[PDB]
């Protein structure tokens, strides 16, 4: 799964780009790890590179 790190500026760009809609809005956005397919689309549109493969 991917994880949205502290860089997140809560722009909202990644949510509509997630093919399985597993991103939730918050102070910083968060991924529902169990549904994430590691497609990387969120990482692709993020202006600050917050979404990265989980550690
Ligand atoms: S990697 Fe894909 S499936 Fe996982 S949160 Fe990002 S866009 Fe959604
Ligand atoms: S696109 Fe990037 S900065 Fe914007 S909400 Fe998603 S993770 Fe946060």
UniProtKB/Swiss-Prot annotation:
Positions contributing to [4Fe-4S] cluster 2 binding: 18, 36, 39, 42
Domain of life: Bacteria
Gene3D superfamilies: 3.30.70.20
Keywords: 4Fe-4S, Electron transport, Iron, Iron-sulfur, Metal-binding, Repeat, Transport
Gene Ontology molecular function: 4 iron, 4 sulfur cluster binding; metal ion binding
Cofactor(s), names only, from the UniProt record: [4Fe-4S] cluster
Boundaries of every 4Fe-4S ferredoxin-type domain copy: 2-26, 27-55
UniProt function note: Ferredoxins are iron-sulfur proteins that transfer electrons in a wide variety of metabolic reactions.
Protein known as: Ferredoxin
Species in which this protein is naturally found: Peptoniphilus asaccharolyticus (Peptostreptococcus asaccharolyticus)
């Amino acid at each position: 799964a991917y994880v949205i790190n502290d860089s997140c500026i809560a722009c909202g760009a990644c949510k509509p780009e997630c093919p399985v809609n597993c991103i939730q809005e918050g102070s910083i956005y968060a991924i529902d790890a169990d549904s994430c397919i590691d497609c990387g689309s969120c990482a692709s549109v993020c202006p600050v590179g917050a979404p990265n493969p989980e550690d």
